[PDB]
Amino acid sequence: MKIRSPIVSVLGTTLLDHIRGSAVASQHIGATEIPMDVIEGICGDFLKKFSIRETLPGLFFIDTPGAFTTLRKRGGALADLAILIVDINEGFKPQTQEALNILRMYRTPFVVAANKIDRIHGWRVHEGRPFMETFSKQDIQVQQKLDTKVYELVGKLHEEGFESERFDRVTDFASQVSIIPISAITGEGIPELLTMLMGLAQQYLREQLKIEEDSPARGTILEVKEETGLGMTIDAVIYDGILRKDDTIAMMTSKDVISTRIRSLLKPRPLKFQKVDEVVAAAGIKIVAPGIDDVMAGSPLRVVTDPEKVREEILSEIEDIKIDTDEAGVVVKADTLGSLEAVVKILRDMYVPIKVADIGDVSRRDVVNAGIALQEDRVYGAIIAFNVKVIPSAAQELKNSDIKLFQGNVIYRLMEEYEEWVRGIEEEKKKKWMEAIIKPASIRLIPKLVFRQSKPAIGGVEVLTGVIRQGYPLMNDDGETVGTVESMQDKGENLKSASRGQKVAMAIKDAVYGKTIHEGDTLYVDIPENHYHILKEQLLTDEELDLMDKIAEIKRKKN
């Protein structure tokens, strides 16, 4: 058993391009590894406070700015730590909220590198010096301008739910994000950037770094791409175990689990490719093997021991990111395995059930399924398609509304759009169910306006409070039943609903003037006990509320 190097993804590049020079100024495919001794050489005595430095090989940086979403293992992120790069002059942006969203979602410890400090008006570069050193040599007004921009970032982070501060002012390192102002182009601030990473390693990394350097290699494919001279190849990161040139490895394709016997393991040329016999966890490597081509970026990579065990172990990992059930509802489609897992994770996070989740453009069958799910709660009758096009065959068999389609290349916007969409469809529901509820309404029988005594009694009437509807039951001042609103007419208009001080000619079935009903009388809607109870959730105008209590008192004298 060994303790490997933490894997660090960079979100938001000359960062590693000048960091690579850091060490070279004394190789992995898709990654750069900075040995611990080099880190200590760059970080003065600032590191001497972190005891994990004596046990780590160094830091393994993934050369993949963001997919991070593609850098994933069973359960989530393959990265142990992460740097979120923000431009300190431009401040926040969209891709920054998308990254933050993803970082908290996967719960990965991270630091923010407030890049481009060299671009602040009046700043004087001090090549490769720690931030504190260079900052203290700047003019008082230049120092103030950097703190102003930093605090604007602290502000945005706060709106987003993260408390944070410039690294040297952080209180409680576990909950505040540490912001390290830097300049990638210059080496300014890089020392503290690395010290805060060693800082996060000290705070959160233990058993996650333990590997069994002899066990069959556990990795993840980040790129399936052609290469001159060696057709299709695979670039992978190994996080546990050992991979050998003669190994057999299984991986997921878009349809099935396959395996291939490796022909070559290639890495960059030391200090185009260089062949190697093996690689140990904490490695980025290019693989040359036969039946790849349809291999999925983001798929697990496993050297094969037992074909049955490896096969189902891979199948189950993917089973969680697919879902093709019948129940629930909501269809999700992303352009990649990682994205898909991110979206499904966020949705699954919002307890929103899913019926479909897969890769590829929206298809007729996705629309059909959005329908089968629409048949129960139109809130599910939606298609959420992340960075994926809509096949013509489905853009037509989708014409019939009822199934909303959210498109976009940014995940939080789509989610925001979903939630609010659900909001309207959520209000445009109570309402629908409200109509079926008999609201409070009061009515006054205008004197000297009797057009008919019995049969429908018919008289001029004024709406006192609320809204009386055709069919509403009417009762006495003493709770006695009087009749039912048969029909209404305002001047020449036939109505079923009348409010305010409307005044109309009203036909009242079952009522009889100078008997059951009397001119001048005030009649009240005979709301049903149950309907009344539904005052909760369903709750009016300051009048309908006072009236509801009155109807209550009125009936109360009998219950």
Specify the experimental method: X-ray
CB 233 within 8 A of CB 290: no
Query: Smallest Cα–Cα separation from 461: which of 13, 279, 355, 451?
Result: 451
Assess if residue 77 is contained within a domain. yes
Residues 110 and 65 both lie in one domain:
yes
Of the candidates 379, 388, 334, 387, which has an alpha carbon nearest to the alpha carbon of residue 356? 334
Angle at 20 (CA atoms; ends 66, 225), nearest 5 degrees:
50
Angle at the Cα of 73 (from 235 to 217), degrees rounded to 5? 60
Q: Are residues 24 and 104 in the same domain?
A: yes
Q: Which residue type occupies 332?
A: V
Task: Find out whether 182 and 123 touch, Cβ atoms under 8 Å.
Answer: no
Last residue of one domain, picked from the residues 210, 242, 269: 210
Any domain includes 253? yes
Contact status, residue 477 vs residue 508, Cβ threshold 8 Å: no
Q: Binding site membership for GTP: which residues? A: 12-13, 63-66, 115-118
Secondary structure (3-state) at 266: strand
Residues 227 and 260 in one domain: yes
Q: How far apart are the first and last CA of the chain?
A: 78
Residue numbers after which the chain is interrupted (C to N above 2.5 A) read 12, 26, 66, 271, 539
**Contact between residue 538 and residue 434 where contact means Cβ atoms under 8 Å apart:** yes
Please indicate, yes or no, whether residues 117 and 196 belong to a single structural domain of this protein.
Answer: yes
Q: Give the span between the Cα atoms of 498 and 351, in whole angstroms.
A: 42
Taken in order 40, 41, 42, 48, the sign of the CA dihedral is positive
Query: Which run of H or of E encompasses 485?
Result: strand 481-490
The answer to whether residue 548 is domain-embedded is no
C-beta separation of 457 from 507 below 8 A? yes
Residues 454, 502 within the same domain: yes
C-alpha 302/C-alpha 485 separation (Å) is 76
Please say which residue of 186, 210, 234 terminates a domain. 210
Measured CA to CA in angstroms, residue 51 lies from 13, 47, 201, 246 at distances of: 30, 9, 10, 39
The alpha carbon dihedral of 383, 384, 390, 391 has a sign of negative
Residues 199 and 241 in one domain: no
Residue for token digits 């970026």? 297
d(CA 43, CA 260): 43
Give the DSSP letter string of 397-453: TT-SSSSEEEEES-HHHHHHHHHHHHHHHHHHHHHHHHHTS---EEEEEEEEEEEES
Both 11 and 142 in one domain: the answer is yes
Binding-site residue set: 12-13, 63-66, 115-118
Q: Is 418 inside any structural domain?
A: no
Residue 417 lies in a domain: no
DSSP letter assigned to residue 25: -
432 within a domain of the structure (yes/no): no
Rounded distance between C-alpha atoms, residue 352 and residue 197, angstroms: 35
Identify whether residues 404 and 455 lie together within a single domain: no
Q: Are residues 513 and 479 in the same domain?
A: yes
DSSP 171: S
d(CA 519, CA 555): 22
| 45 within 8 A of 96, measured Cβ to Cβ | no
231 domain-assigned: yes
Residue-range definition of the domain harbouring residue 358 = 328-408
d(CA 228, CA 22): 31
CATH number, domain with residue 222 = 2.40.30.10
546-to-361, 438, 442, 449, 532 alpha-carbon distances in Å: 56, 16, 11, 28, 13
| Residue 311 · residue 89 · CB < 8 Å | no
Domain boundary among 314, 347, 377: 314
228 and 163 both lie in a single domain: no
Q: Looking at the 3D structure of the chain, how many domains does it have?
A: 4
Among all chains, which residue has been given the structure tokens 């921009």?
149
The helix (run of H) or strand (run of E) holding residue 87 is strand 81-87
Is the domain of 271 the same as that of 126? no
Q: Residue 25's CB: how many other CB atoms inside 10 A?
A: 10
DSSP H helices in 217-306: none
Domain with 186 in it: what CATH number?
Answer: 3.40.50.300
Specify the CATH number for the domain of residue 379: 3.40.50.10050
Residues 42 and 191 in one domain: yes
Identity of the amino acid at 52: I
As given in the structure block, the two tokens for residue 93 are 């942006």
The gap from C-alpha 500 to its chain's centroid, in whole angstroms, comes to 46
Q: Token pair for residue 338?
A: 């990682």
What are the angstrom distances between the C-alpha of 210 and each of 31, 62, 313? 20, 19, 21
The answer to the question of residue 386 being in a domain is yes
Q: Are 373 and 331 in contact (CB under 8 A)?
A: yes
- Provide CB contacts within 8 A for 264, sequence distance 6+: 230, 245, 275, 287, 288
